Amino acid sequence: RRTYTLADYLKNTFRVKSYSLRWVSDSEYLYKQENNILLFNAEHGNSSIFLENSTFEIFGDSISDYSVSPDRLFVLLEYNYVKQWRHSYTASYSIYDLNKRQLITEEKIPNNTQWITWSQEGHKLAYVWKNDIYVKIEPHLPSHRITSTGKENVIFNGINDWVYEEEIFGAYSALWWSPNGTFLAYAQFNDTGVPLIEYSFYSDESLQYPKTVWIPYPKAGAVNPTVKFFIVNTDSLSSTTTTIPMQITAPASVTTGDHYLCDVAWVSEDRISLQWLRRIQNYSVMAICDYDKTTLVWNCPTTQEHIETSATGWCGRFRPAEPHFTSDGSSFYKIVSDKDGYKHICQFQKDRKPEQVCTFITKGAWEVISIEALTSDYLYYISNEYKEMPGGRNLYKIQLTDHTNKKCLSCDLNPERCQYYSVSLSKEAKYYQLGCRGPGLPLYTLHRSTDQKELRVLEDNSALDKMLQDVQMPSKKLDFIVLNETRFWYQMILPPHFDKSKKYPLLIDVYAGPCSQKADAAFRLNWATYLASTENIIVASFDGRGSGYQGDKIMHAINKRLGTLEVEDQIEAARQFLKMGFVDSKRVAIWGWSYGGYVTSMVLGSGSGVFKCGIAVAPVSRWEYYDSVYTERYMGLPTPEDNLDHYRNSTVMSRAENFKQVEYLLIHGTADDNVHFQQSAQISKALVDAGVDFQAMWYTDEDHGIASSTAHQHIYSHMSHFLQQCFSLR
Amino acid sequence: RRTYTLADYLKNTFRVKSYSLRWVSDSEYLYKQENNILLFNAEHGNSSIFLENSTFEIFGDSISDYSVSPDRLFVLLEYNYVKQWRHSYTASYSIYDLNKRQLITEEKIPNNTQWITWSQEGHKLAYVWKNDIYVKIEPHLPSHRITSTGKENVIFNGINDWVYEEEIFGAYSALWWSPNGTFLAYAQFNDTGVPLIEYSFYSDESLQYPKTVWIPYPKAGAVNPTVKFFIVNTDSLSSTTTTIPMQITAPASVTTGDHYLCDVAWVSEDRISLQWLRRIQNYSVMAICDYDKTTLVWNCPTTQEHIETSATGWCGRFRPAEPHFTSDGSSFYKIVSDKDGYKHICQFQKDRKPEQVCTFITKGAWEVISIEALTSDYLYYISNEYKEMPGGRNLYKIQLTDHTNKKCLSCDLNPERCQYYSVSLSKEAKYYQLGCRGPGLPLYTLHRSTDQKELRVLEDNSALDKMLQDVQMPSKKLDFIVLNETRFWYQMILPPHFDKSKKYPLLIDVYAGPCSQKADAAFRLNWATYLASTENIIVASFDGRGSGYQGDKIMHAINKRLGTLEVEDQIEAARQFLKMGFVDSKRVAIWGWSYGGYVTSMVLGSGSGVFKCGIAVAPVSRWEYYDSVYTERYMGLPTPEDNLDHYRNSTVMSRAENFKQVEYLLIHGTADDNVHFQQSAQISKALVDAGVDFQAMWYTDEDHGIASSTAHQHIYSHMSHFLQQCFSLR
Numbered sequence A, B: 001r002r003t004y005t006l007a008d009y010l011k012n013t014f015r016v017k018s019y020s021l022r023w024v025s026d027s028e029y030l031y032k033q034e035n036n037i038l039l040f041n042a043e044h045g046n047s048s049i050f051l052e053n054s055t056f057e058i059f060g061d062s063i064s065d066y067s068v069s070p071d072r073l074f075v076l077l078e079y080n081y082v083k084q085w086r087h088s089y090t091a092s093y094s095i096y097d098l099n100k101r102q103l104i105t106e107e108k109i110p111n112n113t114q115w116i117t118w119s120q121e122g123h124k125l126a127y128v129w130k131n132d133i134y135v136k137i138e139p140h141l142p143s144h145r146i147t148s149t150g151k152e153n154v155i156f157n158g159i160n161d162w163v164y165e166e167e168i169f170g171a172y173s174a175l176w177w178s179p180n181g182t183f184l185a186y187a188q189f190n191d192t193g194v195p196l197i198e199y200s201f202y203s204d205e206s207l208q209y210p211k212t213v214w215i216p217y218p219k220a221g222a223v224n225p226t227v228k229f230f231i232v233n234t235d236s237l238s239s240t241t242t243t244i245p246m247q248i249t250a251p252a253s254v255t256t257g258d259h260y261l262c263d264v265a266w267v268s269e270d271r272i273s274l275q276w277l278r279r280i281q282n283y284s285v286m287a288i289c290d291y292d293k294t295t296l297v298w299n300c301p302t303t304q305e306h307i308e309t310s311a312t313g314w315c316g317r318f319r320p321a322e323p324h325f326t327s328d329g330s331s332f333y334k335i336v337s338d339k340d341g342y343k344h345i346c347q348f349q350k351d352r353k354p355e356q357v358c359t360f361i362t363k364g365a366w367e368v369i370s371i372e373a374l375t376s377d378y379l380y381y382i383s384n385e386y387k388e389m390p391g392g393r394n395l396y397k398i399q400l401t402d403h404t405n406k407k408c409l410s411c412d413l414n415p416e417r418c419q420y421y422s423v424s425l426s427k428e429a430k431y432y433q434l435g436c437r438g439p440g441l442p443l444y445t446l447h448r449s450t451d452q453k454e455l456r457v458l459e460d461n462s463a464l465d466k467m468l469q470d471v472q473m474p475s476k477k478l479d480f481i482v483l484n485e486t487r488f489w490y491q492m493i494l495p496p497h498f499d500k501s502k503k504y505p506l507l508i509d510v511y512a513g514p515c516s517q518k519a520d521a522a523f524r525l526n527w528a529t530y531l532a533s534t535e536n537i538i539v540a541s542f543d544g545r546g547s548g549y550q551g552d553k554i555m556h557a558i559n560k561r562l563g564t565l566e567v568e569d570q571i572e573a574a575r576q577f578l579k580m581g582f583v584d585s586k587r588v589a590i591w592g593w594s595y596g597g598y599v600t601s602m603v604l605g606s607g608s609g610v611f612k613c614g615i616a617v618a619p620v621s622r623w624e625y626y627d628s629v630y631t632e633r634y635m636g637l638p639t640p641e642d643n644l645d646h647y648r649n650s651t652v653m654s655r656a657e658n659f660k661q662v663e664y665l666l667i668h669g670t671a672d673d674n675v676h677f678q679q680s681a682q683i684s685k686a687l688v689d690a691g692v693d694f695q696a697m698w699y700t701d702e703d704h705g706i707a708s709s710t711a712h713q714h715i716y717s718h719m720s721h722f723l724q725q726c727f728s729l730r
């Protein structure tokens, strides 16, 4: 009869396993097993050693990661990894010659590379270093410099500046090899007019004077970085000292004022797709460009333009969805909101057609989460259609030739244990691995695409299961409540022997930012686990307005006015939970991180009287302090000509007074490059001026994730005691 | 039966009055009465209006202060005051013509003056603006620019750079008019090689990007600013476009390496005294310089050199004491430690004499606090000699011609109420005002110097007294305990009906920096008042080793090793208090501000087990982070060639572990330009790495004094609750 200890969480006592494979072909994949890369044969367990427990140790214990060239002839060995922002980081590299069996040592790769990648074909390498792009046709050969305009915090070649890396593309990379690797496309950003933010860094206690880190960061309404798209011909490098890249200029309907680059997608080797967005993400354009062999130039005829629009708010969830072209690249499928505001898959022809550019292949009050593969006859995708559970994930598949031959492939499998799947099809969809994150313990299995025959079970968490036997684990209810005639899902982490008759303290867990989803059918062992399994606290989350994958009516509901409906609904939801009986109204709390810290703060400061205390970690306190791309997408510009009013109305500090009725815990990281601390500094200052006592805690040199080992443990222990004091436990 | 509420303290319910006069002659003074400057006649209450409730309101309600020219013909009206560091500040000025009865409006004075002052004679004005000195022979006349090398944060002309303003001279000023105002001496500092510290400033919540303030600040061992001394002839300004100042170069025995300027003192109009100090304040020189009429140059013959030394530690308390010359300037009296290490008054002759430069006029196990006046026959001073109370203050006087004719002038007056006096003699010591801060309510009275006849009582706090009647005020015990055979004074703020038999919680109040004194006979209404009068907590302070005015044996005891004996003795003292019975050993705490925050932290981290909790406000965590002038004076240089070891041993973070046995509250100001926050940031980080939970609180944009109105209230309310939680009260 043991409970899930806070130490069980902090020291990761119970490990949850998974099967992360790397498809090498349409029939084999790679897998890391005891620091040995093994090549497996989907169909038969047939394995084989690809790289040894060995190799990886020459570069000591700093071997961060590995990347095998597509022709399996070489392997990139990453080491001396150094983080920088959410996705950026620099490392050192070594090419290992599989065949020659040894580390290539001649034309080595710079000891501080910002980014590197193989081509999609052979062993071509493109890497950014010192903000400049370099190409190596083959591992042993010398490095060819592609750009030279590169300059720290000013000119970025092939990598994204801070805001792009964070808000547009999900990563640091701004490179794109064409299939067959003839061309190499890339973006270049000029951060010149972009203002700087400058926080202090204290480093070791031996540093006598703290450093100052500055970052070109555009806050709402500020001058944004600029872009340019280039494509350089890789096949000529050996015959010149310098090659001249060809530039593609964004479509006219976007160039009049500020704008951004949305997505890059190679159709074939003479056709590329680029998506552009206006600073006011009300409008989006996806041009298709063809390579003219004669005049050696790329053309993007308005005839192949394609426009995406939104009268309710903005485009896509975070950005227009990505196109998926056919082989002959004559058509493509893309996820776009239909007439009812539901994100669904529809067809397009390279050439736009007057208000009929689309033809939906999907309908319903549910949404297609993402397209996973496009066979010459089938379209594999993932949706939350099944059982009308917006919080569930299932793998479907439609026959192109017959849009009726639509079939779910994971719905049956384990309806009890699995309702939240992740997929991964082989190079040509011959096999597909399933990742069950579903209610129960994560279950990984691979199947033969043809008939779905489950070849074998890659990973069932029997080990984890065996251990969780001797522990009083809490349960998780995933249902919905109905407000103003609409379903709104929520989830509750119920403490062990949960008796519906008794009264328990409630803790609302929040985020609730645009298009977010806190209520889902995925298994997790987090802090809330400990909170219910040992403190008997009910941890609940509620996806209200401006959220998830339930149509734009619900998501766009927040448009032009953050800090409104999503906050309110969070309070309503608490009301409902109370009316559900088992909640001790005298002990209701609410905490949130990032955007969640904002809502938590806005809720505590609403004077609704429904909450006793709360904790906001690295919250946003007013939208002018947050970056441009994100904020403006939901708020527009902070100008009297636009939405200045809603900007100034949604301030946390403007609700300082109402905090007198609450125990508040404000936590923030000193080196938070995302939500600047300036944000919390402005909150504390507002409460101090209001004469409201509260509790604060800064984390020296910590990120926006306060994720360093010692800090991570410290912050959760601290919040634990805060709740214990607040809930009269401890 | 009402107690002294925390609100009584925060809202300053009970005002303590005083009589701050401004001697205008040897027989009249100025006094602000209901916003009216009144001229009084010492001898007879005879008054008279000098400036009206009026005048002061033309400049609205921003009239910060006033300064009357010595010939009482004009008045400087200060307004638009803006703080900057401990003593620096900028303001706007207006000269009011008393005679012509109106504000001079012609050659006005710059709207951002950094410093201004009248001559000692007529109506000459010298002011610094934009780091340059300017002179105006008369209020109506045009401004003459004296320097032009001035440049922000680089070259300071007539004002001190940060470290000088804070650690050497007690103010912003670096100007010195000669008597008769012929010459104007000044210092010039070059902050060129001095490193910068850069903290953030968030300002109003409307500022989208926080500012960055940088200050040339030398931390221990860093490159210090440089100096130069000049004297310019004021009488020529009208006959030139530019005058050429004459430079005095520091004495050779100081120029070999880094050094500072200690004090400037005009002897007569052709003789000036300058004191210099080596970077290692082991040595000090006071040259006397004469003006050569022929070659128009100042000479500082080594024959008039005068050397001050210390084999135990450093010179003076914070700096060599100031000289007090006779009329004919043939001799001077200065406070210097005698053979036994006791700060006493002794005579000097302009010319140095081989190891006999002095002749003491005072002896004993007590010290002369300060010299107050030097008549042609009498020397008025202040000491803690009486009743052998190092924490008491009394005004004495010695006859020059007969050093036996020594007499105390305040010892009798009110032995019960007054034991801590402040003085203020008229221009030629004909009258002297006494300021009783003594145990009881502050009592101000003026006396006729001749026979001491108390002419009248300027201010007795009858009003305050009448109000404190209906309140249960706590008492104050000022005694001493004896350790290792030596007296060590302490003081206790005992809660109201204090019953020696019961047990009360104890709170140690600390500072204990070199030459400090927390145990004295002065009346006060602070936080500790509320803490005893309403929380029944015993607030006690203990002046241990490295302190007060009890000889260098006690003060220099800490030399080259801060964070040692002064910490220990603070713990010993608590032991003693416990042995005194009336202390609930299960509830002993300790808090301190600034240096006190350091000791508090060092004590809590000593694992002595004697303290339950504590609060450190803007503490120092390791001496390398603190400025040079101060640190090095007691620690030397942080180099292996000197005292690097004691620097690294006295770290607060090196005692992180021991904090697991204590409830700790760390508080710090965001814009602390003195003790950088970097200091607390390094502490929190150390505890986080050690896995020690604790409590923190930052004050946005607050100073080292966290003295803004709202912050001041907030911080004390917060500390109050922290003690209440810790002491199980509240």
Ligand SMILES: O=C(NC[C@@H]1CN[C@H](C(=O)N2CCSC2)C1)c1cscn1
Residues within 6 Å of the ligand: B166, B167, B168, B169, B170, B318, B319, B513, B594, B595, B620, B630, B674, B675
């Ligand atoms: O007031 C004087 N010295 C006292 C020193 C001036 N600044 C030091 C300070 O601010 N500390 C804060 C943390 S520990 C030290 C104390 C002083 C006046 S004239 C020469 N010295």
